[PDB]
Paper text:
The M2 is a proton-selective ion channel, and it plays a pivotal role in the uncoating of the viral core during entry and viral assembly. M2 ectodomain (M2e) is a potential universal candidate for monoclonal antibody therapy owing to its conserved nature across influenza virus subtypes and its importance in viral propagation. We selected a 10-mer conserved epitope of the N-terminal region of the M2 ectodomain as SLLTEVETPI (labeled U1) used for screening against the Tomlinson (I + J) scFv phage libraries. Four distinct clones (AU1, GU1, JU1, and UU1) were obtained based on changes in the CDR regions.
The crystals of scFv AU1 in the apo form and as a complex with the extended U1 peptide were obtained. The complex of scFv AU1 and the extended U1 peptide epitope was successfully crystallized using 0.2 M ammonium citrate dibasic buffer at pH 5.2 containing 20 % PEG 1000 at 20 °C. The diffraction data were collected at 2.8 and 3.4 Å resolutions for apo form and scFv AU1 in complex with extended U1 peptide, respectively. Apo form of scFv AU1, crystallized in the P42212 space group with two molecules of scFv in the asymmetric unit. The two monomers of scFv in the unliganded dimer are related through a pseudo-two-fold axis with identical CDRs facing each other. A comparative structural analysis of liganded scFv AU1 with unliganded scFvs AU1 and GU1 and models of scFvs JU1 and UU1 was carried out. All the scFvs superimpose with RMSD ranging from 0.358 Å to 0.498 Å. Interestingly, no significant conformational differences could be observed in CDR conformations. Furthermore, one of the scFvs (AU1) significantly inhibited the release of viral progeny from infected cells.
Residue numbers in the entry: 3 to 117, 134 to 243
């Protein structure tokens, strides 16, 4: 089984520094690029950084350029994010993810507390439904992204899980009631019959352009009493 274990999160003062670590097992660590994606409290997913297979090249998001440094030790199968000059905006749960575009495995995340791109828009923002219902989520892109569109499921209290990649291809182990379709700028994720485990927040992510960008997400919750 594939395992990603983050550590290093904690409370720090603004301007301070932290070092996050990710321990990987169950796959050839050196064969893949590794990324950090963060989620601010009550907000959506945001790609932070990516490092290539042998540490040759690194990419950063504009908000962290100059303050963050990603590194890896392929002998220790470990990934590092050195966060310097921390700000209040940096407060978030930081996730360790495999790959650079299609994040097929995620760690559980570590919480860090501080005392021109393609825009993806999801609709609805939230929706209340019941078991057995049919749910349809729409993801729209500011410019054409062909079919380079992924869908992630994030159950409450859990890390994101890859559902669909390249618009319509189901990930191994995903139930058939999930289906994805669309092209260009307009995409849909459909759950044909809701099950109690399907109540979660769903995110769409484009990897047509670097950096990859996410939608705000769609919360699918049970109908309140």
């Amino acid at each position: 089984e594939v395992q990603l274990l983050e550590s290093g999160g904690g409370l720090v003062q603004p301007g301070g520094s932290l070092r996050l670590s990710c321990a990987a097992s169950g796959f050839t660590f050196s064969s893949y690029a590794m990324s950090w994606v963060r989620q601010a409290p009550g907000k959506g997913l945001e790609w932070v950084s990516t490092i290539l297979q042998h540490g040759q090249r690194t990419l950063y998001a504009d908000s962290v350029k100059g303050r963050f440094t990603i590194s890896r030790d392929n002998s220790k199968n470990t990934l590092y994010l050195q966060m310097n000059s921390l700000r209040a905006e940096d407060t978030a749960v930081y996730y360790c993810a495999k790959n650079r575009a299609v994040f097929d495995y995620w760690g559980q995340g570590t919480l860090v507390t501080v005392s021109t791109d393609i825009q993806m828009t999801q609709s609805p923002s939230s929706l209340s439904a019941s078991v057995g219902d049919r749910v349809t989520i729409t993801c729209r892109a500011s410019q054409s992204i062909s079919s380079y569109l992924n869908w992630y499921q994030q159950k409450p209290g859990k890390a994101p899980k890859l559902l669909i990649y390249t618009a319509s291809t189901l990930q191994s182990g995903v139930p058939s009631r999930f289906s994805g379709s669309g092209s260009g700028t307009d995409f849909t994720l459909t759950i044909s019959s809701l099950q109690p485990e399907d109540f979660a927040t769903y995110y769409c992510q484009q990897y047509r352009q670097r950096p990859p960008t996410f939608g705000q997400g769609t919360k699918v919750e049970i109908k309140r009493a």
